[PDB]
């Protein structure tokens, strides 16, 4: 069935547009969301040393 996105009413009512001037102006979503979800850095990366280690295979 059809479940569609981006068809929504952006509220020009107050308390939405507050956070819209805050949003455009202060970059909170950009900063918090992105910079933090990269600050997700600390997870142990996945890398394998090919001479000394080898990836999985199948019979």
Partner 1 sequence: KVKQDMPPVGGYGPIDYKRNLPRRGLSGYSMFAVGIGALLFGYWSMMRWNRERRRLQIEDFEARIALMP
Ligand X SMILES: CCCCCCCCCCCCCCCCCC(=O)OC[C@H](COP(=O)(O)OCCN)OC(=O)CCCCCCCCCCCCCCCCC
Residue numbers of the site for partner 1 (CB under 8 A)? Answer: 15, 18-19, 22-23, 26, 28-29, 32
For residues 31 and 23, what is the distance between their CA atoms, to the nearest angstrom?
A: 10
Stretch that binds ligand X, among 7-15, 22-30, 44-52 (CB under 6 A): 22-30
27 binds ligand X (CB under 6 A): yes
Total interface residues for ligand X by CB under 6 A: 5
Q: Contact 22/28 with Cβ under 8 angstroms?
A: yes
- Count of residues in the chain: 59
CB of 6 to partner 1, least distance (A): 13
For residues 22 and 10, what is the distance between their CA atoms, to the nearest angstrom?
A: 15
Identify which of residues 15 and 43 has a Cβ nearer to partner 1 in the complex.
Answer: 15
């Amino acid at each position: 069935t059809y479940k569609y996105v981006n068809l929504r009413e952006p509220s020009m009512d107050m308390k939405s547009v507050t956070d819209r001037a805050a949003q455009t102006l202060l970059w909170t979503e950009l900063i918090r969301g992105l910079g933090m979800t990269l600050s997700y850095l600390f997870r142990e990366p996945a890398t394998i040393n090919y001479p000394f280690e080898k990836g999985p295979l199948s019979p």
